[PDB]
């Protein structure tokens, strides 16, 4: 099969820095017209995608030129000079060559994550979800640097997690920073009855996770 695959999977330079997104197909991108039937695409969060280049290197209408490059047989390089603000989006190659063809894995353009650790605001929920539900190790973050994110969601005051799940916001803050959310497995009374429930959060320059938690009986 054609197998268009991307090289970087994400970009994390500061805005106005210089970069490229690159791809290689498995084989066979030339048709023996020699136009190279491949394209380049983006979609920002919640957008249906659009092309930014087609027929290997013909740019889309109003394309930034710094954010535009070319295909070249099996291998290709989309330019990312002068890393434009609000250009941080899912981006990849696509095979125009034949009917089963696939888009590349949507490599994420982003701003450079600063040293910023998230705020320690997290704890187990208030009474309408803790006492009326479960006093579990609920976790949170605000303005975290996304590049080395971490979180806590465990009983007995562990300051870690394992039986837990989490999600992160867009990198919209000046630190390339994002909000964050998470939750943890514990008994509906036992997570508050234990020595603490953890709620901590960490980021790309955090020396340890922020002290979000509930004390024994404070959950």
């Amino acid at each position: 099969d054609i197998v268009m695959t991307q090289s970087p999977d994400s970009l994390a330079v500061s805005l106005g820095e210089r970069a490229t997104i690159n791809c290689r197909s498995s084989q066979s991108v030339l048709y023996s017209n020699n136009e190279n039937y491949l394209a380049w695409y983006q979609q920002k969060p919640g957008q249906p995608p659009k092309l930014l280049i087609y027929w290997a290197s013909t740019r889309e209408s109003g394309i930034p030129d710094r954010f535009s490059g070319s295909g070249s047989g099996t291998d290709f390089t989309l330019t990312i000079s002068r890393l434009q603000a609000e250009d941080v989006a899912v981006y990849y190659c696509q095979q125009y060559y034949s009917l089963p063809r696939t888009f590349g894995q949507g490599t994420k353009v982003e701003i450079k994550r600063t040293v910023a650790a998230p705020s320690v605001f997290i704890f187990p929920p208030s009474d309408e979800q803790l006492k009326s539900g479960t006093a579990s190790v609920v976790c949170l973050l605000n303005n975290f640097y996304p590049r080395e994110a971490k979180v806590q969601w465990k009983v007995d005051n562990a300051l870690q997690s394992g039986n837990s799940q989490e999600s992160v916001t867009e990198q919209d803050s000046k630190d390339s920073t994002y909000s964050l959310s998470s939750t943890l497995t514990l008994s509906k009374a036992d997570y508050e009855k234990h020595k603490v429930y953890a709620c901590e959060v960490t980021h790309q320059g955090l020396s340890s996770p922020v002290t979000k938690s509930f004390n024994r009986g404070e959950c």
Binding site: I2, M4, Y37, A39, Q47, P48, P49, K50, L51, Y54, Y92, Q94, Q95, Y96, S98, L99, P100, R101, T102, F103, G104, S119, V120, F121, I122, F123, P125, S126, D127, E128, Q129, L130, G133, A135, C139, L140, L141, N142, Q165, S167, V168, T169, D172, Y178, S179, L180, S181, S182, T183, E192, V196, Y197, C199, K212, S213, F214, N215, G217, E218, C219
Partner: protein
């Protein structure tokens, strides 16, 4: 603008069917192959094969050969695609992004002139997996326990919870607050129902007592919400 760009939305359980529509402008029935495609929330796009709208000739991607139906409804302007034998794992976005038009002097069913690289407006659509825990609006108090509340690092109010209709305008932003909402996502728990942890920033006094509330109206359930979630 592009009428060939996608439309409509649905929710359906395992073993159900699904539907789609478009319109005969821009990449119309006279102007492209209606090369439908889908993408999961966790992934890049995949082909649902190709359709030629007038006369309705087709090719299917073989990964979906027993799961797919097509329609030459060009009198209604619609390349009205459909699907069958859906699953929870089939829940995905869908789009109608057109082919790059015919590239030669010839005429006919040019189903050798496309692939992944659709070259016209997608507009988007979605089919939600109705295997999940279908339920009404809820706004869980993301505001903190006694160890974390009443300090300058805290945040208050509530976020969307307990329903497969997990999207809601929660964010601790029900007008009792109207700025400083930390965008902590409404991710699904194991039953597909929401488990959101969003909260609104405040002064350290409000962060220990304020009447913060979430506008947690479960969007796929249509019902409104405004539930309070005060710290401490």
């Amino acid at each position: 603008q592009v009428q060939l760009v996608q439309s409509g939305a649905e929710v359906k359980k395992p073993g159900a069917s699904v539907q789609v529509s478009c319109q005969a402008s821009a990449n119309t029935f006279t102007n492209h192959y209606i090369h439908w495609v889908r993408q999961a929330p966790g992934q890049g796009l995949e082909w649902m094969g190709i359709i030629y709208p007038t006369g309705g000739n087709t090719i299917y991607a073989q990964g979906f050969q027993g799961r797919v139906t097509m329609t030459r409804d060009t009198s209604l302007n619609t390349i009205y695609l459909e699907l069958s034998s859906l699953r929870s794992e089939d829940t995905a976005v869908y789009y109608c992004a057109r082919d790059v038009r015919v590239d030669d002097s010839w005429s006919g069913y040019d189903l050798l002139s496309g692939g992944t690289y659709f070259d016209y407006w997608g507009q988007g659509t979605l089919v939600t997996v109705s295997s999940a825990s279908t339920k009404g609006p809820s706004v869980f108090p993301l505001a903190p326990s006694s160890k974390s509340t009443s300090g300058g690092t805290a945040a208050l109010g509530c976020l969307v919870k307990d329903y497969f209709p997990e999207p809601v305008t929660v964010s601790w932003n029900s007008g009792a607050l109207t700025s400083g909402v930390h965008t902590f996502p409404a991710v699904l728990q194991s039953s597909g129902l929401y488990s959101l942890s969003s909260v609104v920033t405040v002064p350290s006094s409000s962060l220990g007592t304020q009447t913060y509330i979430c506008n947690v109206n479960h969007k796929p359930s249509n019902t409104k919400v405004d539930k309070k979630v005060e710290p401490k």
